[PDB]
Amino acid sequence: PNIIKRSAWEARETHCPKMNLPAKYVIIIHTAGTSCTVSTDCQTVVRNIQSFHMDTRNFCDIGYHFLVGQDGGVYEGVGWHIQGSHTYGFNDIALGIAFIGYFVEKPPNAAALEAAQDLIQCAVVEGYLTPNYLLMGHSDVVNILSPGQALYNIISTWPHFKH
Numbered sequence: 001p002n003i004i005k006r007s008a009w010e011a012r013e014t015h016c017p018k019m020n021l022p023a024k025y026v027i028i029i030h031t032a033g034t035s036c037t038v039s040t041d042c043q044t045v046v047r048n049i050q051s052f053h054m055d056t057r058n059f060c061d062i063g064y065h066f067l068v069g070q071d072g073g074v075y076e077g078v079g080w081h082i083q084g085s086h087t088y089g090f091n092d093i094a095l096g097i098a099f100i101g102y103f104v105e106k107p108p109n110a111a112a113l114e115a116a117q118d119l120i121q122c123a124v125v126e127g128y129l130t131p132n133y134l135l136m137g138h139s140d141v142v143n144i145l146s147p148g149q150a151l152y153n154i155i156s157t158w159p160h161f162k163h
């Protein structure tokens with residue numbers, strides 16, 4: 001897919017750690033904030049995410065390698081060659097792809113989903129991602145207690161658990 005570069009959304013220039021390529025994992029994330037369905041709005045959101053990550057979160061740059069808007073566009077975060085700040089303990093081996101929006105109740109539209117799969121496939125073709133890469137959701141990294149793990153299963157039987 002034709003990637004919308006940092007220059008397009010007027011990203012703040014930085015000098016961050018380099019990425020270890022090819023990446024071996026793809027971690028899907030959602031920004032959990034507002035979505036965007038037209039390019040101009042997506043550029044604004046991406047720019048504001050970079051500012052928040054840097055100024056408030058103290059990250060070196062925006063934490064995602066790429067972001068996907070519901071305009072069907074793929075937006076360069078830090079890109080292929082820069083380390084992410086999206087999932088601690090995996091930022092230099094995992095490509096963090098974040099869907100712009102909140103997708104708990106509804107999924108991103110077909111345009112966004114297809115753009116994401118196209119990006120992942122292209123990553124392998126170009127050598128940015130290993131052909132035997134592991135795809136997972138943000139919560140799937142083992143250090144984040146999640147469903148299926150022994151401890152999670154036990155606390156899910158405790159009072160007040162999600163109710």
Ligand code: NA
Nearest residue numbers: 139141144146
């Ligand atoms: Na986990």
